[PDB]
Design a protein around this ligand. Structure first.
Ligand SMILES: Nc1ncnc2c1ncn2[C@@H]1O[C@H](COP(=O)(O)OP(=O)(O)O)[C@@H](O)[C@H]1O
Ligand SMILES: Nc1ncnc2c1ncn2[C@@H]1O[C@H](COP(=O)(O)OP(=O)(O)O)[C@@H](O)[C@H]1O
Ligand SMILES: [Mg+2]
Ligand SMILES: [Mg+2]
Ligand SMILES: [Mg+2]
Lengths: 526, 529, 98, 170
């Protein structure tokens, strides 16, 4: 080879070897990932080098935690990561369709064809499939029942039915509760918290906020029944001047005077807070809660506790916006313009203790625009799995709201596109008909895999499914408990339109780019 | 010869040192073996007749105990399935505090029984659904067996009789004495409100005489020494400070600057006079003893000795809070004479010696107080640690009794009744889940079987007699330990009871762990680092 | 066999043999201070790593100077220390009795 | 008082920090299991500047451990004095997409340091120990100093960085 004569330590794979390597890697990935698809898929256990345990079924986690050092695997993993971070679902189908496309392409390439013909066929088939998908979709009003169906369909594929029924209502309620009829949905306004006890069927939604820290002074009250809330990020610790400074005294009395005088700056702010509290909560009937993003000295803590104030220090930055949205106050960086209009209201504040950890609950807000999902369970891996499922469900519901349309599922759409493309292909001129046929056969992988996982015969089941949808123009999918054809829309199986669109685009682009590689070379520095 | 090169695909793309197991033969049947072996490891430490076990950890520290949680914590496990079982046991210990061996026995039995169903043909899903149905039925059945609920949690004899069993399961012979001690200690600090904090019972160990010389004290003891000349006070008014017992200085860097000689000659005299004034101002309020959390100065100690003030320095940042709770004082972050509300009151404060140990004692006559302490005397640190663990289990049992008042019979009666009723229910269910339900029912005999084996009798005769006597309608009959011939005894009359909540949580967690282990299909391990 | 339960290097021993072994080790521990009892008892000389010598007739001191690492044997050292701390005399008799 | 918290980054940085914590522990009365044997009060005067005392008398260091490898932290844990660190004070492929790599790692580090600074009363600074010329010290350390400064732009940040014929008239 030319490269070897210049760099004897280089590695190279030429025309046919490169294609063989790429096809082999893609098939190897899909052979492992094909067992995740559908609600009937099995669970994989992953153990790291540190000894941790992770039970999972999601495609992205499996891809990024399975031990592999292949370049094609790296490319496919990057594509799956982009899919995940944009849409939130469809990671496994990406790999399945890419692998099937490469296999079907190699099937015809092995008989002397050139990859460019299959590439043109792929492009034409993609255009036709997008045109068909644009018309197959169903536009609805996106009411609570439709959202419940979509969320249940998206969540049933990760956990069992008993927990999925619990999670669906919480996810839908949170999404609806943080929604206004404009200004597209902004996450980070739903907080995910996990507490390790009280088995997962106790996972709930709180119309308020939960903070993972509590009061630090022993004498502070543990429960407030009607609370004014102050939110701030001003510092109540001792502060040193920016320029270098030092005290020069002459006697012990002067030292005492200086010691007393070095605290007035913070004592002034504490006095301002105390005066506002006494102005607002005249009698001992209400309560006062302070949340600060910065530290609080023990002297300030004692001064506040002497008047019945519940103070929390060093909260996180996003809680500054969350508390404002929920309670309805103003986050302020100075006490120069303090007034009751800067306060918020909360109907209940209390505290819980879990051994070495402490939690604070703010509850009974009037009209909260921010809520919290409280995850519970007896295992760290259980909590992680539930967190991933909740992410999936929230993303699915948000995408369903953002789009005006939803699509029938369970392979009906794949069957319909295959049928349409088969009839379209005679119109094409040349040998691109082979590429169109390969694209259709690749699209027919999802119902096959679903039937295989459910435990039926792939060929017979697909033949029955295609036997229907041709004598009746209905959209027909696979029933996973009987193997018979069914109608997805009537049963209640739904899928996202944006997910399918993105999946088609990404799979076609990656397959086309992979098929055109001429050689693989490693000739740089080691 | 020739070689089998590799399989194309994942087998070639796998990293070096990684492991990939798949299928029933390579994953499930090995996980069941690991869990069964782990259960067999600790099976022999169950019941009153359980034998102690000696474990040395990686730091050459010696443990002697028969507590399942401690044994599992000190062992180091490399197998993930046993790791999940261990976490289930630890969660049970955190939630209740007793029943950490029942979980292991139940999970091992459930898995070893599901193995033969998988062998004869049933799939994993049908086993899982049967187990879940059986668990729900067991939780429904359980309340009807409740008998002899707790009546008064402020009666010493009733509390001792309720707490006897959970201590007798670890210290066979000393259970009466330990129950009396723990009952006194727990009843002392139980408020009017139901709130009972476990942390309010302190344990102090002094090397010396035998266990029978242990005692309970209404107050606090510290293994410290008095810093001053005064050693005893007969009616103590206590001041508590968090700052060091010294003249304070600026937070910013300071410097004494002098331009004449009079200032140089007067500085130290002024400082000494100021310190004397502060100390006398503190002493004028009537304080006898000053407790500080930080450094003391020589001049401050000199003046405190001059004015007859007892000075004690304790330093944990938590012992100070506990002492404040005990006496009724509030820690002061600045050195100022206290106000009456900030002033604590204790009857006796003194320094004593027990078995080559100098201690400082704050003692009350009040039978309630705020906290109490248990002083243990033993001839070996390991023995004292074991007695400490028994005391902890007794305290946890008292707290659980505070949470819920219901009791159920023990020594196998509840398990036999549950097994019989679950078998009767599973007889009438048509389908392929009846086998799983019957196996779940059969798994309950492992507890009486283990008790009989540890006792040293024939388990088959014990189980047959239990079934025969339960067929006549006697729901409170269980294994007899004292007899040398396998026999049965009425548990309600003998007072062998145990809490309802513990059984509930144990069954729930064991079933969840078993089904979670059964749900795994294939395993991917990275190389250890 | 493919994946083992505990870490490699773990040692376990159960049943009558290990109990008999513990009984045997306690005999050696008692033999260490046997001849230091009574008005006609001798004393022992112990040399440590640094060459410093200790001549003693006290049972607790001798047992402390011995570097015992047997888990069953350590109990006889513990009881001797307890007796010394509690009453201050009788450190050999308790070990011999045990 | 005057609490200081510590950050360890990289393999060599983690090793250096482990050595420093070991030696300071032997200097104080702290032992590997987290209890106290020291006989001099001067070993306990300023123990709170470096340690948090848990309920029960145990002490834990005020340290944070970070590396982009599942083997360095495990090696530290396996090595002596590695069990005294709190189990949740650990942060753990190299380059995914996301348009920015390490954004979740830096957020996890910020959350952990916030939780650690919550416990202390009047903290004053951060001691950062990392490689300087290394890739983790320049690129993968995606201006972590800048992120810390933005989070707390009032406290000190002390870093231990590894080191002619024409000469006529005018
Ligand atoms: N109850 C159901 N019956 C038939 N098909 C289903 C059902 N629930 C989900 N599916 C199908 O499973 C497919 C894959 O979903 P899933 O297995 O969660 O992985 P991903 O969503 O990442 O592709 C979806 O296309 C959906 O149509
Ligand atoms: N006197 C007794 N006679 C018969 N069984 C007893 C007696 N005391 C306790 N038990 C039984 O011992 C069983 C287990 O207790 P134990 O050995 O302490 O382990 P754990 O309580 O952690 O499961 C309980 O189910 C109880 O029924
Ligand atoms: Mg999905
Ligand atoms: Mg018990
Ligand atoms: Mg003598």
């Amino acid at each position: 080879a030319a490269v070897k004569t210049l760099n004897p330590k280089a590695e190279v794979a030429r025309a046919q070897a490169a294609l063989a390597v790429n096809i082999s890697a893609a098939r190897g990935l899909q052979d492992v990932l094909r067992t995740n698809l559908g609600p009937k898929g099995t669970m994989k256990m992953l153990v790291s080098g540190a000894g941790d345990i992770k039970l999972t079924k999601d495609g992205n986690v499996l891809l990024h935690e399975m031990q592999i050092q292949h370049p094609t695997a790296s490319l496919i993993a990057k594509v799956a990561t982009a899919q995940d971070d944009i849409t939130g679902d469809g990671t496994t189908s990406n790999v399945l369709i890419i692998g099937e496309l490469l296999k079907q392409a190699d099937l015809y390439i092995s008989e002397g064809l050139h990859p460019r013909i299959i590439t043109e066929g792929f492009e034409a088939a993609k255009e036709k499939a997008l045109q068909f998908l644009e018309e197959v979709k169903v536009s609805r009003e996106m009411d609570r029942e439709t959202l419940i169906d979509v969320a249940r369909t998206s969540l049933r594929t990760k956990v069992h039915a008993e927990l999925a029924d619990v999670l669906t209502e919480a996810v839908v309620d949170s999404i609806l509760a943080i929604k206004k009829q404009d200004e597209p949905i902004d996450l980070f306004m739903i907080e995910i918290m996990e507490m390790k006890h009280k088995s997962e069927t106790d996972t709930s939604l709180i119309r308020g906020l939960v903070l993972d820290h509590g009061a630090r002074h022993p004498d502070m009250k543990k429960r407030v029944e009607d609370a004014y809330i102050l939110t701030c990020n001003v510092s109540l610790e001792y502060e040193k001047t920016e320029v270098n400074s030092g005290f020069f005294y002459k006697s012990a009395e002067e030292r005492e005077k200086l010691v007393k005088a070095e605290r007035k700056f913070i004592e002034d702010r504490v006095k301002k807070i105390i005066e506002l509290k006494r102005k607002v909560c005249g009698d001992s009937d209400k309560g006062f809660v302070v949340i600060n993003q910065k530290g609080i000295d023990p002297f300030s803590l004692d001064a506040l506790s002497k008047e019945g104030i519940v103070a929390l220090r060093r909260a996180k930055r996003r809680n500054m916006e969350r508390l404002t949205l929920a309670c309805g106050g103003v986050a302020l960086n100075s006490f120069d313009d303090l007034s009751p209009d800067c306060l918020g209201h909360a109907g209940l504040v209390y505290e819980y203790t879990l051994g070495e950890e402490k939690f604070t609950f703010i509850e009974k807000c009037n009209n909260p625009r921010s809520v919290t999902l409280l995850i519970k369970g007896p295992n760290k891996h259980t909590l992680t799995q539930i967190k991933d499922a909740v992410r999936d469900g929230l993303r699915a519901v948000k995408n369903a709201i953002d789009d005006g349309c939803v699509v029938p599922g369970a392979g009906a759409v794949e069957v319909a596109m295959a049928e349409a493309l088969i009839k379209h292909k005679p119109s094409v001129k040349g040998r691109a008909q082979l590429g169109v046929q390969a694209f259709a056969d690749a699209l027919l992988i999802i119902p096959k895999v679903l039937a295989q996982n459910s435990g039926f015969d792939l060929q017979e089941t697909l033949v029955k499914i295609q036997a229907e949808h041709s004598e009746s123009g209905q959209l027909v999918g696979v029933d996973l408990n009987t193997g018979e054809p069914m109608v997805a829309a009537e049963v209640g199986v739904w899928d996202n339109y944006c997910v399918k669109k993105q999946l088609l685009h990404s799979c076609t682009v990656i397959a086309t780019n992979i098929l055109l590689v001429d050689e693989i070379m490693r000739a740089g520095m080691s | 010869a020739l070689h089998v090169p590799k399989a194309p695909g994942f087998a070639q793309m796998l990293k070096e040192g990684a492991k990939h197991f798949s299928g029933l033969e390579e994953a499930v049947y090995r996980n069941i073996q690991a869990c069964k072996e782990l259960a067999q490891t600790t099976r022999t430490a169950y019941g009153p007749n359980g034998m102690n076990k000696m474990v040395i950890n990686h730091l050459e520290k010696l443990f002697v105990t028969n507590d399942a949680a401690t044994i599992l914590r000190e062992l180091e496990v490399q197998h993930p399935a046993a790791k999940m079982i261990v976490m289930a046991s630890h969660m049970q210990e955190q939630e209740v505090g007793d029943g950490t061996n029942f979980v292991l026995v139940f999970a091992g039995a459930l898995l070893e029984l599901a193995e033969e169903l998988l062998r004869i043909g049933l799939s994993v899903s049908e086993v899982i659904e049967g187990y879940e149905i059986a668990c729900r039925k067991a939780h429904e059945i359980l309340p009807n067996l409740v008998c002899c609920s707790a009546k008064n949690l402020r009666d010493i004899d009733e509390v001792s009789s309720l707490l006897r069993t959970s201590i007798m399961s670890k210290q066979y012979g000393n259970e009466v004495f330990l129950a009396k001690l723990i009952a006194q200690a727990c009843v002392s600090i139980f408020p009017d409100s139901g709130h009972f904090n476990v942390d309010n019972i302190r344990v102090c160990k002094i090397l010396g005489s035998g266990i029978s010389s242990s005692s309970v004290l209404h107050g606090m003891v510290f293994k410290k020494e008095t810093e001053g000349d005064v050693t005893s006070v007969k009616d103590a008014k206590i001041a508590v400070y968090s700052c060091p017992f010294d003249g304070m200085i600026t937070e910013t860097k300071g410097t004494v600057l002098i331009k004449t000689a009079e200032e140089l000659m007067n500085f130290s005299k002024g400082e000494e006079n100021l310190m004397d004034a502060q100390v006398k101002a503190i002493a004028d309020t009537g304080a006898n003893v000053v407790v500080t959390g930080g450094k003391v100065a020589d001049m401050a100690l000199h003046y405190a000795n001059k004015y007859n003030i007892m000075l004690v320095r304790l330093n944990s940042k938590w012992d100070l809070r506990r002492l404040c709770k005990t006496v009724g004082a509030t820690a002061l972050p600045r050195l100022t004479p206290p106000v009456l509300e900030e002033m604590g009151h204790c009857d006796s404060v003194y320094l004593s010696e027990v078995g080559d140990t100098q201690v400082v004692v704050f003692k009350h006559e009040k039978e309630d107080g705020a906290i109490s302490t248990i002083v243990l005397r033993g001839s070996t640190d390991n023995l004292m640690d074991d007695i400490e663990r028994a005391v902890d289990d007794g305290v946890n049992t008292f707290k659980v009794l505070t949470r819920d008042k219901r009791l159920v019979p023990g020594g196998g009666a509840t398990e036999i009744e549950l097994a019989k009723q679950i078998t009767s229910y599973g007889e009438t269910c048509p389908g392929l889940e009846q086998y799983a339900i019957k196996k779940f029912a059969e798994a309950f005999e492992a507890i009486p079987r283990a008790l009989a084996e540890n006792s040293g009798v024939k388990a088959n005769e014990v189980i047959s007699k239990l079934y025969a006597v339960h067929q006549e309608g006697n729901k409170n009959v269980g294994l007899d330990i004292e007899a040398e011939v396998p026999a049965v005894k009425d548990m309600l009359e003998a007072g062998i009871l145990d809490t309802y909540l513990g059984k509930y949580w144990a069954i729930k967690l064991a079933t969840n762990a078993a089904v979670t282990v059964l749900r795994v299909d294939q395993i991917i391990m990275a190389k250890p680092a | 066999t493919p994946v083992i339960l505990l870490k490699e290097g773990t040692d376990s021993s159960q049943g009558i043999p290990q109990l008999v072994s513990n009984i045997s080790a306690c005999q050696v521990i008692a033999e260490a201070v046997r001849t230091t009892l009574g008005p006609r008892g001798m004393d022992k000389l112990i040399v440590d790593g640094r060459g410093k010598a200790t001549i003693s007739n006290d049972g607790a001191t001798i047992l402390k100077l011995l570097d015992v690492v047997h888990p069953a044997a350590k109990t006889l050292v513990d009881i001797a220390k307890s007796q010394d701390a509690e009453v201050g005399d009788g450190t050999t008799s308790v070990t011999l009795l045990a | 008082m005057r609490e200081i918290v510590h950050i360890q980054a990289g393999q060599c940085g983690n090793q250096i920090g482990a050595k420093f914590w070991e030696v300071i522990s032997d200097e104080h009365g702290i032992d590997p299991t987290g209890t106290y044997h020291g006989d001099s009060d001067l070993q306990l005067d300023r123990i709170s500047v470096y340690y948090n005392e848990a309920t029960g008398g145990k002490y834990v260091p005020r340290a944070i451990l970070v590396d982009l490898e599942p083997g360095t932290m495990d090696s530290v844990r396996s090595g002596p004095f590695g069990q005294i660190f709190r189990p949740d004070n650990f942060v753990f492929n190299w380059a995914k997409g996301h348009y920015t790599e390490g954004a979740e790692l830096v957020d996890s580090v910020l959350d952990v340091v916030r939780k650690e600074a919550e416990s202390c009363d009047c903290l004053q600074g951060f001691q950062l120990t990392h490689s300087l010329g290394g890739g983790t010290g320049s690129g993968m350390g995606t201006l972590l100093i800048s992120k810390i400064r933005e989070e707390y732009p009032d406290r000190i940040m002390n870093t231990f960085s590894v080191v002619e014929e024409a000469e006529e008239e005018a």
